Every structure is written in C-alpha cells, then in structure tokens.
Amino acid sequence: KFYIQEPPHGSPNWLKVGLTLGTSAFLWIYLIKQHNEDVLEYKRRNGLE
Amino acid sequence: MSLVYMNIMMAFTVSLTGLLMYRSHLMSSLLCLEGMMLSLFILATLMILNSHFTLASMMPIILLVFAACEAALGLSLLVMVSNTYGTDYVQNLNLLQC
Amino acid sequence: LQYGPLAYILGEKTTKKMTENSKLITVDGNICSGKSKLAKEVAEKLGLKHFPEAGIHYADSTTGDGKPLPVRFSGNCSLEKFYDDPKSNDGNSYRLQAWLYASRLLQYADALEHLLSTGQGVVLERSIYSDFVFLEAMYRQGFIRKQCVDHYNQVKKVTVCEYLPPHVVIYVDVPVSEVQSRIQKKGNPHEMKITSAYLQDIENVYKGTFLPEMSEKCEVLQYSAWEAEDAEKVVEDIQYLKYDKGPWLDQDDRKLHNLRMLVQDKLEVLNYTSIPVFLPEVTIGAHQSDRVFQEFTELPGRKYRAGYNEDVGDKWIWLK
Amino acid sequence: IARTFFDAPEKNYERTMAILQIESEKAELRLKELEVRRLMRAKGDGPWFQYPTIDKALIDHSPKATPDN
Amino acid sequence: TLRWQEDPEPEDENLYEKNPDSHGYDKDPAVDVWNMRVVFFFGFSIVLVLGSTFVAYLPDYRMQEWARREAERLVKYREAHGLPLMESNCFDPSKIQLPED
Amino acid sequence: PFFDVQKKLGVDLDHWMTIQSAEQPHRIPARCHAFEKEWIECAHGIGSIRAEK
Amino acid sequence: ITKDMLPGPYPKTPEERAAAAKKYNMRVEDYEPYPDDGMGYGDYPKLPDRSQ
Amino acid sequence: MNPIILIIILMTVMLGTIIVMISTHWLLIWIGFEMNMLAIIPIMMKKHNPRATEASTKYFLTQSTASMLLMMAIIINLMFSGQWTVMKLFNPMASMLMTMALAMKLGMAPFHFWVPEVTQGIPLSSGLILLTWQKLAPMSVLYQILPSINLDLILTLSILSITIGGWGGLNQTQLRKIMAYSSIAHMGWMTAVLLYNPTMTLLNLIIYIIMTSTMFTLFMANSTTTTLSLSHTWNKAPIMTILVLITLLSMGGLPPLSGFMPKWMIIQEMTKNDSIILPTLMAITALLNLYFYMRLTYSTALTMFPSTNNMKMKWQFPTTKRMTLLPTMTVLSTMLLPLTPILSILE
Amino acid sequence: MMTGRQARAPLQFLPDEARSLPPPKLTDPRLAYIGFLGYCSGLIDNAIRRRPVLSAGLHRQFLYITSFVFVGYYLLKRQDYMYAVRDHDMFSYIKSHPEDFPEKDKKTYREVFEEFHPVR
Amino acid sequence: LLDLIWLETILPKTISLAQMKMSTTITSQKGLIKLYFLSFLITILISTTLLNFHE
Amino acid sequence: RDHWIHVLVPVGFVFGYYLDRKNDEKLAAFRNKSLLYKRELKPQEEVTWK
Amino acid sequence: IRWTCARSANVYPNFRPNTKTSLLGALFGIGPLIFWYYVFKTDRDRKEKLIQEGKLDRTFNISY
Amino acid sequence: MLKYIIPTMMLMPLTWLSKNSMIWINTTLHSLLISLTSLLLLNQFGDNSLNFSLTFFSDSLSTPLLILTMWLLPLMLMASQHHLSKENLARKKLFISMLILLQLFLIMTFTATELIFFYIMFEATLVPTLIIITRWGNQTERLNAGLYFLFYTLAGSLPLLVALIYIQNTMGSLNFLILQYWVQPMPNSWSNTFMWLACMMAFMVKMPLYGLHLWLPKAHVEAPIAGSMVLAAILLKLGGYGMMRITLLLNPITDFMAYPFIMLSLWGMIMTSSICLRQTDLKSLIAYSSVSHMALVIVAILIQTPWSYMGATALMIAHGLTSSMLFCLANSNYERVHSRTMILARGLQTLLPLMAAWWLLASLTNLALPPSINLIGELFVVMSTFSWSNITIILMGLNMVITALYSLYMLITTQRGKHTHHINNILPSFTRENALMSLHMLPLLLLSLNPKIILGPLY
Amino acid sequence: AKTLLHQYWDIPEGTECHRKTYAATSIGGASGLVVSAYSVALKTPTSFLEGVARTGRYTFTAAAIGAIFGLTSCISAQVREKPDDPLNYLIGGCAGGLTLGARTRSYGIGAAACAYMGLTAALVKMGQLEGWKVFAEPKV
Amino acid sequence: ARQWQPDVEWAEQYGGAVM
Ligand SMILES: Nc1ncnc2c1ncn2[C@@H]1O[C@H](COP(=O)(O)O)[C@@H](O)[C@H]1O
C-alpha cells in the first residue's frame, strides 16, 4: 500500500463494470437487430429481392 | 361592444398605470395586482354570463384560485423584507445593482 | 461519491448515531501551556478521538503517503525563520499565519466530518475559532501591516460563517514568566528569540477578546497551570455540564446533512480561503507557480487521482 | 510518371462532367424549392405552411334544449 | 515595500558549453545527431533532389508542347490549300443570328 | 413547439372546454351555436390561410 | 525596466520638468521638450538638431 | 433543502412546463406558467440570504405582471373570437399584449431590466435553471401564435434586445451578469428569425440551451463566480481552462464550432425573404458579444494570472463535485458543425 | 414549417413510411463521425477527472461510443425521412400545378444577345 | 502623422470610444425597480400611440 | 512494433488514397459517354478507365 | 529603449486632435489621393475616348 | 484531396503519442514525407482544372499555394523548436497540435470547390493563429494585436457571408465551376455597388489594403516566429486567392468601381515603403515590405488583366518565401541579441560570415534581382499596369528606388560597420538555423530555372 | 409616427423646402421626446425644473438637427437639380452633424457626426431609391 | 527574456466592480 487512507476508487466497482458491459452488449445487439429488420422490410417493400 | 366592457378596460388600464409608477412600498404593488385580479375576474364573468357559455364558468373561479395562491407567495416575500430591513420600502431594493 | 442525498433518502440519519457522548471539545492556551498531553488524557477518558495541532505538513499528512512534503511544495514558510526575523522583507509572518489558518480549517473540516459520520466526539487543540489571537498578537507587536489584518478578517468572515462552534472549550491559564521559563527549560535552540511581549500580547488577546465571546457562544471552562494536571477533575467537570448555549441545540437532520455534504468536499471548504485579494505577502506570480506545479505533478502518487497511479502500484487501472 | 501516378485526361474529363451534371441538378432543384415555397406560401393550399384550425369532430350534433340554433 | 514573489530572470542558455559539437537541437547528443540526419536526408536528399527530378519531368505540362506540335500540323494544312493563315472570326458566321434593328 | 400528447395516447384533457359549440351538460345552447358550427364546418381541414381568405 | 523610467506626457510645471530632466539625465535648463502641438513627441527633449 | 421536497419541486416545475407544452387550451397554458413560477420560487431561495430574497421579489413581480397581461390578451381574444384553441389570435390588441407579455416573461429588452439583476443574486444552479429551462415554454407559446404575430413589434423587440444585451454585457465583470446579457442577446437573435422559419428558432434554442448548460456546469464545477477566480482556476485544472476557452470560442459564433451553426443559418433565412441590412446589424452586435467573450478568454486561459499561496492545498485534493454531463455537453457544443442538417429532426 | 404534415400522426419519431426508405449503412461517414464524437467525449471525461486518458475507463469509453453511435443512427434515420418527405412534397406539388411552372424555351447562343464590355 | 495617429483614429478608435461611452450610459442604472416599471409604462404608451404596433 | 508510430502516417496515406479510388467509383455516371472520347470498347477491356 | 518606446508606442497616448493636426492630415492624407484619382480618371477617359473612335495605334498590341 | 487530409489527421496522434524527446524528429520526418507526396497535384492542364470530387478541386492557381503551405510547415517546426525548449511537454504538444490543425485548415481551404465552404474554412483559419499570437507571443501588448487581427478579419468577412448567401439564394449555387458556366453580368446599380463592397472588403482587409493594414505592424511583431510566418506567407495569399475567385463574379462593374481602391494602393505602397526608410524595428520593416508587395498584388488583381494575374501569383509565391526567410533572420538575430532594435547589433559580418551571406541573398531576393521569381512577378505587374495606363510607371518606378533604399539599408546597419563593443554573446551559427535558411532559399533559386508551374491558371 | 414618415416622403425632393423642413423638424422633435422620456424614466431627475430643462434641451437639439438636415438636403437638391442623388442627403447629414457638434460644444464629435450622419442619410436615400426593405414581410 | 505574464496592475484593472 501507498496511501494511508484507502481511496474510494481504489478497487474497481465490479457491479458497475458488469452493468456497463451488459448495457453496451445489449445496445449493440439491439442496433444490429434493428438494422437487419429495417433493411429486410426495405427490400420487401421496394422489391430488391 | 357594451359600455361596461370598456369601463372594465379603463379600470384595468387604471390599475396598470397605478402598478408601475409607485412611490410606496410593495403593499401598493400587491394592491394594484389585486386590482388586476378583480378586473380580470369581472370581465371574464361578464363575458361567460353574456354569451351563455355554460362550461366556461370553470374559467372565473379558477382564474382566481391559482393566482390567489401566487398572491399569498407575494405576501411571504414582503415578510422576508420585513425580516431583513425593518420596512418593506422599494428604495431599500438597491443592493443588487453593484 | 459515497455519501449523498440518496443515502439520506434511504435512511442514513446522522442523529441516529448522535448520542450524549458526541461532543466537540477544543483546548487552548499559551505557546507552551502544557495542554498538549492534557487533551490526550481526555482521549483516554471519554473515549474521544484526539487530533494534534495543525502543522505546516498537516495537509501533506492527511492525503497521499502521509509523509511530510518539502516546504517548496506546501507552505513556503518556516517557523524558524519567523522566530529569527518577524519583520522580514519576504513576509514570513503573515504567510505562515494564513497557511496555518488554512491547515486548521482543513483539520476542523476533518473533525466535523468524523464527528458527523462516526458519531464519536473529537478533541482538538487551537481550533479555527482561536487562531486570530495569534494574528492580533502580531499586529500589536508590529509584525504585520493593517492590510494583512483586514485581509485575514475578510478570509475569516467568509470561511467561519458556514460552521458551528465547539461544545465546550477549555483554556489553560499559564502566565508569561511561567511560559518563558518552560520555553527555557524545553531546549529548542530557536524558541527564545521571541520577545516576552509576544506572549503577553497572546495572553491579552486571549483574556480580552476570546473569553468575552466564548462565555456566550459556547460552553467555557478555565483552569490554572497546576489544575491542568488533574485529569479526573477536568473530566468530571466536563461530564457534569448543562448545555444550553450554542447553536448545537437547534440542529435538525436536514441542517446536519447539509453540513456533512459541505465538509466532504475539500475544495468547497477551502474555496473562499484563497480569495483573489492581491497582498504582496501571499501572492506568487505565474512563473514560480507554474514551476512548482509542474514539479508537484512529477511527485509520486500525485500525478493522477489516488486510484489511478501506475508508478505506485495500482492494478486494474484500465477497468475503472 | 504518367503511368504510375497521374490519371488519364479522359478519366478527369468524364469525372468533371459527372460532377458538373450533379451540381447543376442540385442548383436547379434548389431554385425549384425556392419558387415552390414562395408560391405555395402565398397561395396556402399545399402540404407545408398549413397552420392548424379547429377540428370539426368536437361539435355536438345532438338536438339541444332550445331548437332555435 | 516589496512586490509580489517572482523568480529572477533566467539567463540565456549557451548550448555550446555543455556540448562542443551541438547543433541547436536538443541537450543529448544522440537525439541531436538523429535530428541532423533526418533533416538533411528528408530535407535535401529526399524531397529536394527527387522534387527537382519530378518537376524537371512533368509529362508535357498543360499540353503546351503538344499545342506547338498541333501548330506544326495546322499551318502545314493552311499553307497547302491556299487558305488564309488565320480567320478573323472564331466561330462560323453562317451560324450567327444578329439582333435585327 | 406543440407536442400533441392527447392525440398520441388518445385521452381527452381539455378538448371539451376548447370551443363554445362543444357538448355541454343538459345540451344548453349558446347564443351563437349555429354560427360557430357553420364557421367550423367551413374552416375544417383547409388551412388557416384559406380559412381566413 | 520599469514604468517610471519610460517617457510619459508633456510636463507643464517646474517639478515635473525637473523629474523629466532627472529621468533623461540632463540639466533642468538643457531639457527643452517639444511644444505641445498634439503630435506625439511626449516629454522627449529637443537636441540642437546636429548630425553625428 | 429536503431531498424529497427538492425532487417534488423539480417534478412540479417539469409538470408545469410540460403542461404549457402539451395543452390545447389557453387556461392550461396559464396554469402551467403559474405552477412553473410558483415552484421555481423556492429554487432561488435555496441559500437563504437577503440578495436571493431581493432577486426573487423582483422576479415574482415581473412574472406576475406578465401573467396579468397574458390574461388581458386571453380575455380580449375570447371577446373577439369566442373560442379557446391555442392558435392564431383574432385581434391586433390581443397579439400586441401577448407579444409584450411574453417579452416580459422572457426578459426581452426593454423589458429585460430584471434579467441581469435576478441572475446576479441567486445560486448558480438556480441561475442555470432560470436561463435554460424557463425559456422553453414561452418559445412554444410564441411558436403556436406565429400567424397573428405583428412583424414590426417582434422585429423592434428583437433588434432592441440584441443591441441592448451586447452593449450591457460589454461592461459587466461578474460572470452571472455577463451570462444574463448574453442570454438576452441570444434571445433577441433567435426571436428575430421566428416569423420566417421557426425551425431555425428551435435549433438556436437547443444550441443555446446546451451551450449555456456547459458554461454553468463549468462555473459550478470550478466554484467560480467572478472573473478573478475564473482566472485563478488555472493552477487547479488546466484542462478546465482549455474547455472554457474552446466553449467561449464557440459561444461567439466562430467557426468551426457549434455556435456558428444557428446564426449563420439564421442569415440563410434572412436573404430568402429579401432582408440584407438586418443580418448585418445583428452580426455586428454578435461581434460585440465576441468582444467581451474574447475579454473573458484573455482573462481566463490565454494569459497566466498571478495566483495566491493556498493553491498548494488545492493541488492535494481532486475535484469531488458531481460533474454531471460536462464531457457530453462540451463535445456537443464544439464539434457539432459537420452534423448541421440534424436540424431537420426539429421540423 | 411542416405543421400540417405530421399532424395526422403526432409524436412519431420514425413513422411506418420511413421504413420504405433505404436505411443508412453501419459504415456511414456521419455515423463514424458521431462515434468519434463519443470517443472524444470519453477522452474528455477521463481528462477532466485526472485519470490516464488512453487507459482508464475502457468500458466507460465503449459505453460512450455505443450510446453516441445509437443516437446518431436514429437521428440520421429521422433526417433521411424528413428530407424524403421534403423532396417528395416538392415533386408532388410541382406535378400537381404546372401552370405556375411553365416550360421555358431554352434558346441557343446563336441568336441571344450578350452585352460585351471590353477590358483595357 | 498618418500611419500611427490618424489611421488609428478614423476606423477603430472612434468606434471603440462610441462603444465604451454608450455602454457606460447603458449600465449606469440605480437598481430601482420603480424606474424600470416607469420605463415599462413609457414603452407601452409609445408602442400603443407613437408607433401604433397594434394595427 | 517498437517504431509503430513511424508507419502511422504512410499507411494512413495509402488507405486515404484507396478511398479516392472508391470515390472514383461514385463518379462513373459518364464513363465512355463524353463526346471527345466516345469509342467502341476494345476486346478484353471492361471499362475505358477504372 | 527609451528612444524606441518614444518613437513607436508613445505617439498615440500623447496626441490631441487640434486644428494644426487636422490641417496637416487633410493636406497630406487625402490630397494626393484625390489629385492622383483626378489625373488618372482624366487620362483613362482620354484613352478610352481615343480608342473607341479608332484613332489610337493599337495594331500590334496583342499583349495586355 | 482526401489523400492529404487523412495524413494530417494521422499526424495529429503522431504528435500526441510520441515521447518527450522524439516529438520534433517524428513530426519533421512525417511532414517532410507529406511535402514530398504533395507534388502529385502538378498533373494540371492548360484548359481544365484537376477535379477529384464534388468538394475538392485544384487548378494551376491553388496548387503552388498548397505546395508552399505544406512545405512551410516543416520549416515552421524547425524554426519554433528552440525558443520552446523550456516549455511544458503538454504545451509543446499543444503548439505542434495547433500548427498541424492550421496546416490541415489551410489545405482544406485552398481546395474548396464551392465558395461557402471556402468562406467558412477561411474564417476557421482564425482560431489557431489567434491562439498562437495571444499565448506564445513575447511582448506585453500582444492581446491588442490579437484582438485587432480577429476583429478586422471578422468585420471584413461577415458582409462577405451575407453577400455569398444572397448570391446563392439568387442564382442557385456557389460552385466555382458552375459559377464559371452560370455567370451573369452585374449592372451599374447601387445594389451592385454594395454587393461589390461586401464581396471585396474582407479580402482587402486580409491582403491588407493600405488604410486597413494597421493589423499587420502589430501582429507581425509580437507574435512568435511560426505565427509570424503563417501571417506573412499564407493568409495574405489566402485573401488574394479569395479575391481572385470572387472577381470573376463582379463584371463589368469593377471596370468603373476599382478606381479608388487601386489608387488607394497606387499611392500607399509609396509612403509605407517610405516608412521602411525610418523604422527602428526590423520586424516592422519586414511587415511593411509585405504591405508594399501585397499592395502591388492588389493592383494586379484589381486591374484584371492576364499578365497582371501571372505577375500576381509569381510575386505571391516569391514574396511569401522571401518574407518567411526574412522573419527567420529577424528571429535568429533577436534570439542572439535579446532585442528587436535594429541599431543595436552592428557589424555582424565580422562575427557571422555565413549569416551575412544569407542576409545578402535574402536582401537581393527582396529587391527583385533577376532572374528570381520576384522580378518576374513584379515585371509582369509593371507591364500589365503600363498597358492599363502610362503615367503609373512613375508610381511603380519610384518604388523601384525606395525598396532598394530600405532593403540594402537593412543589409547595411545590421551587417556593415564597426561591431558593438558590449555585445559579446554572439554564438557561432547553429546548424538548425543554416538548414532552415537553406531550405527557405534553395527552392526559390531552383524554381528560378522552371517558373512555368507558378505563373497562374491561364498560362 | 409612421404616417409622419410618409408625409416626409410624400413631398418630392428639391421641390418645396417649407413642408420638408417642418416634417423633418417634427420627426426630430418626436425622436428627442422619446429619448428625453427614456432618460427621465431611467435617470432620475434632481427636480421637476431640471428634468424639464433636460427634456427641452434634448427636444430642441433633436428638432434643430432635423430642421437643419431637411433644409440642407432640400437646398442641395435644388442647387443640383437632381432629386435622385445621395449627395444631397450626404450634405444634409453633414450639416446635421455640424449642428450637433456645435450644440455639444465639440468639433471632433462634430466631424464624426458629419461622417456617420451623412453615410446614414446616403443609405436612407439608397433604400428609398432601390427599395431596400429592412423590415421585410415573410415571403417564402 | 522569458515570456511576459500579467502582473498586479492588470488584475487590479480587471478586479473592480465596474470595468
Ligand atoms: N503565530 C505563531 N507563532 C508561533 N507558533 C505558532 C503560531 N501560531 C500557531 N503556532 C503553532 O503552535 C505551536 C505551539 O503549541 P504547543 O507548543 O503545542 O503548545 C507551535 O509549535 C506552532 O506549531
């Protein structure tokens, strides 16, 4: 140890880190699924099949 | 329109010219605010009762109550001045200029 | 930030831990009054935490490794030079007094935070309500100017007014001749250089300005030189007190919560200490400030936040 | 130098031709936009600049107490 | 009285005393020599010489030389069929409609 | 701007008080119910400019 | 350098002229400033207009 | 400052503003205005000092006078129309009274006389609230009444507000009065464009809201209220000095920053309607705005002001304040220019 | 200035006919610019709290990039829908009223008179 | 005569002097709310009569 | 690599150069259509210019 | 340093606009400009009038 | 032009990721490599412009300016890497970042296809120059110079914005090719009078025109060497390029409109040159020489004859290189003697022979010694203006005296005479300074052989 | 005071001096009355007499400015036989500036007022001739 | 020699309640 008092940010908040990772993964797969659904509906609407 | 309508407009302009060029403390301003209150109430009630708009009888009473609470707020503000400078004069309101 | 309004919503009430033994006690006295151990005795009587006198390196001690930082990084003022030349050209006197007042304000903020959080009473020596008795003792001896006096008055007026006075204060009455004899027998090679007029001025400001207002705004006890040794009498006197004065009576949970929020932001405590008033004893130009700031940034443990220094051995820096 | 680095004059010529055609079409469309905005704001019978009026669905069609209405 | 605290004026840095073969680049000699090498290679040996080679051999700039060759054809045409050297009208006058007045 | 929450989620809050020719308790007629009815049926869905012209 | 070792406005009374002569290190009689025509000469003295 | 009471008061302010936004009746518009000012009164009495009482008294008097004028306009409109839909008014006196009532509410000159005073006497969070969220509702009210707005009155109010705000901000040294006069000038700038294309008005409102929020967030983060402490902050965090420098560069409409987005495009809707002198005049007053902005950045970051001795203790403590949304609002206020056509979402 | 267009379906960020357009690709340059804005926001957030800028808060930076790219994609979709509405309405009103838009006979340069001002 | 005084006087310094002078006239209020409301009355009267903004 | 920054710019050059060729593929609406260079395409040649 | 600051930066703080400086600025600041403008306008009008009536020898003047 | 913007955007992390001792070498190497790759823009034609896409194009006018800009940036990094050796690492990296951003801004501005993009980029060039002037300047009153520069530029350029948006709303586009093919004559009306004034006054401010040149003798002096070079050798030519683009759109009003403005230069470049006869500050003398050359450029562009255009661009390039070299010479002498007074340091030839040779070469190239580029440009301008009118040869010919009468004077007092006694810190010539001055001078003498690439778009 | 501008512009330039003079005098008097009223409302007068003295000073000064400017513009338009010239308004604006400088006991202020008022009157003539509209109705 | 920075005079110019 180096600091006499333990800093509040000394240890990584594992709950918040897992929450950030899960939110990023959920938003990425939701964006990908939304883009796939929208492009499928676009090709079905305009007949680019 | 009717002459009583124009009398209410002239009364509201009288309250307006009394509310702006005051010389006394804030109680005169709140009294002229209540003059505006009363003129607007009487005008709205006369309009609603003359044109037989039955539902808009909700307009006058509400037109009091809300601003009436607002008027109560103003009273508290005066009490704050009465708790700070002793008198609620408007000439003591020259601390924020500098 | 750990403690916030969300904790107060969730039920973290600070008067839950505010028992009858949570008392803020500060002890005062002359330069060598011998009170330094006496408060320690109180620390083993009521179980209260004791804090030493706020020195130059106190802010260096509370954060980081706690090692005493060099005087260039913190303070830029020495007590030995003040004992040597009180009327010096560089103005060691007022700079030392302003730095010591700032350190005492930091100590009082830490003490109030500890009392509000842990619920345990705190014993201090020479709190921020008893520091001006030094500075006035300078001005009656001609050690400073009038501009320094009114600048210190402005700093005290903008800093003290957000805090509450201690519960009980204790003043040890040691006369000037006893103080000079104790200094002579102590053996410090640089402490005899002060005139006895300085100690007389300290005593005069104590008994003329401090006591007439601490007999009103808080609880006050007074003891002579030999009665300070008898610890059981002092603790029996402070434990049989009737608190009726002081603004500690009319403190609800909201005001104490606001006080706890304000004392946990160390920038907010010291924001008004260094007001932009340019007095040539405390202002330093851009070049020296830039040089010492770039040198302090190169110190170990201080380049980044406390949890984000690779050179001191902090792991998982990339996952925070 | 002309083989490794520099593009052919015909390539630059036809690229310039395509760029000029695209920008001319954009300029003509912008002028048409200004003209159509002026004309249909002045006449007020288009999809834009349609300030709302009172919806007719809120009128009561039931008979009233007094028939003189 | 005394003004605000400030350091005295730092003297100018004479670089040649700490290094007899320095070149006004940096304190350490190795990085100074590297800076010399990179400036004299990529400033004279690389950009200037190859730049002079490049500008000396643009591929018949602005087609201007080609225009001379075209002139070498054109008068050769117009000195064969008896046509005048150069018409005073840039366009054909038979395809011009003047505004009638 | 003019956010239309009432038209979005389909709940009336103040459409009944808005006009004089609206439905009122016991169907009490106003003085100008027919005139307002004809004016609204003239000026519905055609725009304010063409309504005032 | 410092501010009071630098030229300022046109002096009028004797003591300002003496201070200017002290700054310009001439005698109080050999210090003859340019006339106040509003041209910008300031307190700079008039040398006798001779080449080097 | 009970957290439950503060949360309820903030929800009341939000409810009043959204009641102004989403209603279809004039009475509900006034209801939202009254509840908004009633619940915003305790925000400016947070610190419990007499200057706050002075500022709140002046604010209450001006807002209540504006509300009484607003009922005068509503009752006149009822007389001449007999109906209550929030749309174009049916009387020139109704439009005139409504226009200066909303000018009084929004601090438009010459009815601006409360804006540089009240913002001087209230805490910085309350100043941010008053200069950011209060301007939203009467913009909606003015947007919904634009067919009946008289051109001459709103143009005179706009040019007077821009000129007066620039010339009043040219002299003040306090940060809050400079912010107040800058808000007045921006209000005039984005009310000058309202009658021609209100999408530009909404875009300038969003840009001004974001940029003022960034400025006030930086001022609460540095705990600085005057020019001198804002100069002194360079010992504590130079990155904050860089941030305030770049967002004050953005504040004067200098490209390639976000503040050049609205006003230039406002000029893009001035020459469409054949008006040339007007954008030039407002551009010159924007240059005045940029002059005192340049003065602020000269005092702040482009020089190195002399500091005091106690900065050393402030070098041993990091900034513990809840610096909320500072990086996102700083990025959105500087590098949003290549995404200019995003204003199409505001149609 | 489209107050009469969206009034039939109010408070719709992305209507159904917006699905008839070609959606923007995931490699749109504007979308990558908004992702760069998110990365810059993460860097600024690391810099203002006195942290290592390029190492600390990697999950924080990824969340910033992801949120910015998501909101940028949806805003770009709304922008494309709005401009499709704009030029569709332009072409529709041009087609519906060709009396106010006459076909101009584009005369050649062989007879039109251009005034010449010599330079000397 | 020209490049240090007169050219400095015509364009920038006259503009700066007028700016600072009228800025000092604008920001010289006494903070009295009564004067502000009297100016409001004068503005309203001028707008209603001397400009006729309601026609 | 130990000197990776030294190849940061040239690669970032050529990729950008590559993008220019990609930009060329967005401006081929008049390929072999100009009146000066309209010619019959030679065998084993798909375009006049890529 | 005194001479350089008197020559460069201390000319405007010690300037008063009076009749002598105004007359010297009007004689030297705008007089040559209007004189040159008048003589050049006269010369160019004469040259254009000579050219447009086809009397000036411009037979071999093809560089301009 | 996406083959040059991306290398600069990759140079930005290249100076944000290097060590504290390797920023200068890496930045210099990569900027010199980009300068080597910059020569691919010379694939020009005598009748067509090299167009890359809808946003970027480059004819034979903007190409020499681009080459000069991204050749000047490595020279800037060499010239400004000694007096910043005492600065913080973060501030040094910020300085390099501002220089790289300024180069990116300039190379994006010079290839702008449409005029509104050129205008916004032209105003965007303000920020790093203002930051450099107001931050790294040496003298006390640099804030006044920065404010004067920023306000002169903005007050010039905002009516330019209004006029450009009016033109775009009137006709339909602001592309330079489209405006070349959709040009319309402007009649002699007062609306067209104010249109011409709004379209011109920004460029007359940044050239600068005589009368509005007062932002130059301050901002060229108190700024550092890199800011002085970017003010003297690029931005004036940026205004000239903008005026060259704009003046196509304002015919035939200019033929009776440009009578005062031309003559506002045709006398001014006399007396400003006379100011160089009586200047105690060397940097102010260089700035006033730049004022005279830009006044000649103003006359050449405003008479709108072809030979005037060729002389204008040739004198632009030659004067930019010569003024950058002279500013570097002034900076080196100021570094050695710690004073900008010209009369202080005397007899430098007896102590510095190579620096005296560089002084002689720079002064000779300043007085238009044939067959250098400056003589070619100024001679073409004199031929064109003599074609315009006869008597104006006098208004050029007397300048032919006065230029020499100061330039060799600047050569004499700083080099020739008995050396100063109390000055004894004149170190021998640094290799960095000699390398920088050779890199300034040798391209000029090499382009003296083949000037046909810098003679304009219509050669 | 909108129809007063119309009555000022209803009289043709350089035809009748008297009615143009009274119209410009009334315009100046109205402007001075507005300025004096705002000055009294904002800056508190010492008494009634000093307040009406300041009001009369401002009103008479602005009325003199208007009368001098209108008279000078009309006599210049008569002496040049050209109503459609901004030179007459430039001369009238300089005369108004000279009168304002003489009233304010100054000469540099008078010359600056000459320049700026002449340019402003020239631009007023520019807008009158070419139909410039600073208060433009919404067209598109 | 070194770069100049504002002294006490500039700050007291900017330190007044009215500038
Ligand atoms: N003005 C002052 N002069 C000397 N010492 C001071 C002054 N103010 C506070 N002190 C501190 O008070 C201490 C004396 O208390 P003590 O010796 O513990 O009874 C000194 O050693 C200093 O740390």
Side-chain angles (χ1 to χ4, degrees), chain B residues 18-76:
Chain B
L19 196 136
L20 308 195
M21 70 195 208
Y22 41 66
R23 70 191 94 189
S24 165
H25 29 282
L26 291 176
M27 281 314 327
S28 299
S29 93
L30 257 58
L31 283 157
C32 296
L33 215 67
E34 295 289 335
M36 301 215 178
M37 211 76 167
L38 173 64
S39 147
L40 288 157
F41 201 108
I42 302 313
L43 200 49
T45 289
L46 279 178
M47 247 299 322
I48 292 327
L49 283 182
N50 181 31
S51 151
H52 259 253
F53 198 2
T54 308
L55 275 164
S57 288
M58 271 75 88
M59 187 43 133
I61 286 175
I62 288 309
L63 169 163
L64 167 139
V65 167
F66 276 133
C69 185
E70 186 203 17
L73 180 133
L75 286 188
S76 281

Side-chain angles (χ1 to χ4, degrees), chain E residues 12-16 22-26 31 34-36 38-40 42-44 46-48 50-52 54-56 58 61-64, chain M residues 21-22 25 29 32-33 36 39 42 44-47 60 71 78 81 338 428-432 435 438-439 442 450 452-453 456-459:
Chain E
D12 203 289
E13 181 84 5
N14 43 237
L15 195 36
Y16 288 122
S22 177
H23 306 272
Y25 280 135
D26 166 292
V31 52
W34 207 339
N35 204 355
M36 226 162 95
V38 68
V39 62
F40 274 8
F42 292 86
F44 293 112
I46 276 299
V47 55
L48 255 190
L50 291 182
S52 54
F54 196 91
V55 190
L58 261 73
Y61 190 37
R62 311 205 79 177
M63 282 162 296
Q64 186 265 324
Chain M
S21 64
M22 310 302 263
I25 292 93
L29 169 133
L32 283 162
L33 280 183
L36 169 63
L39 282 170
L42 287 176
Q44 307 284 331
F45 316 108
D47 48 331
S60 296
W71 176 245
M78 311 215 68
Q81 66 176 328
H338 276 287
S429 302
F430 289 116
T431 309
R432 168 179 43 85
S438 43
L439 284 181
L442 289 183
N450 202 0
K452 79 180 189 287
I453 74 176
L458 71 169
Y459 148 71

Side-chain angles (χ1 to χ4, degrees), chain I residues 97-115:
Chain I
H97 280 86
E99 317 85 10
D100 304 84
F101 289 81
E103 277 327 288
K104 184 68 165 64
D105 290 332
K106 295 310 297 283
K107 285 162 312 297
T108 47
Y109 274 141
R110 77 172 257 278
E111 92 297 320
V112 70
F113 204 13
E114 280 185 352
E115 185 65 36

Side-chain angles (χ1 to χ4, degrees), chain H residues 122-334:
Chain H
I122 63 183
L124 275 174
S125 74
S126 48
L128 156 79
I129 282 179
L130 186 46
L131 290 195
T132 320
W133 183 255
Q134 190 82 4
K135 323 293 197 193
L136 187 52
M139 269 313 79
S140 64
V141 183
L142 273 170
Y143 167 74
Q144 299 187 45
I145 67 158
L146 93 170
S148 278
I149 284 181
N150 204 359
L151 171 82
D152 213 18
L153 178 57
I154 194 67
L155 271 283
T156 309
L157 281 165
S158 301
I159 61 172
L160 228 56
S161 285
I162 296 164
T163 43
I164 273 183
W167 265 303
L170 212 53
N171 200 10
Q172 303 301 321
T173 168
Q174 303 278 309
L175 297 180
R176 277 157 291 180
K177 280 201 172 185
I178 276 181
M179 271 324 307
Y181 280 126
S182 174
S183 168
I184 291 172
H186 279 46
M187 281 306 278
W189 248 100
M190 65 158 198
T191 49
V193 64
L194 183 60
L195 271 189
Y196 305 100
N197 209 4
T199 317
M200 281 325 98
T201 296
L202 293 179
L203 175 78
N204 201 1
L205 169 61
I206 283 173
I207 286 300
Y208 144 78
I209 271 178
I210 289 168
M211 283 178 27
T212 316
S213 292
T214 280
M215 199 32 31
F216 271 81
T217 308
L218 282 152
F219 283 174
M220 311 215 298
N222 272 323
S223 311
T224 52
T225 58
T226 60
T227 321
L228 257 291
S229 57
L230 171 83
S231 79
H232 264 164
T233 203
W234 77 271
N235 293 31
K236 271 143 71 194
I239 177 61
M240 300 267 288
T241 74
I242 292 172
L243 287 200
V244 300
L245 163 72
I246 59 175
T247 187
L248 273 155
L249 258 285
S250 178
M251 192 85 158
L254 256 169
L257 300 147
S258 80
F260 192 56
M261 230 181 316
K263 39 173 73 172
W264 153 52
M265 291 218 56
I266 284 178
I267 304 174
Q268 206 261 352
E269 309 285 345
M270 301 334 307
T271 40
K272 276 185 181 291
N273 291 280
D274 193 339
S275 60
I276 35 173
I277 327 163
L278 199 73
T280 315
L281 262 61
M282 318 151 29
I284 295 307
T285 323
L287 286 194
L288 256 77
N289 276 15
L290 197 35
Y291 178 60
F292 58 77
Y293 290 154
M294 267 290 92
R295 147 195 291 154
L296 255 186
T297 88
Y298 280 2
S299 85
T300 312
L302 290 168
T303 48
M304 271 205 278
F305 260 96
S307 63
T308 83
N309 193 34
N310 300 318
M311 281 325 98
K312 312 175 177 64
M313 311 216 308
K314 276 155 140 135
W315 301 338
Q316 286 172 356
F317 295 97
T319 66
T320 61
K321 286 195 171 71
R322 36 195 169 279
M323 301 205 328
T324 317
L325 270 166
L326 187 55
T328 302
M329 265 175 172
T330 310
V331 153
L332 286 181
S333 68
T334 47

Side-chain angles (χ1 to χ4, degrees), chain H residues 92 110 113 117 150 167 171 288, chain J residues 19 23 27 29 36 39-40 53:
Chain H
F113 284 138
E117 325 273 358
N150 204 359
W167 265 303
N171 200 10
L288 256 77
Chain J
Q19 286 315 301
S23 172
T27 58
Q29 326 279 58
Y36 301 147
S39 64
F40 295 162
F53 275 126

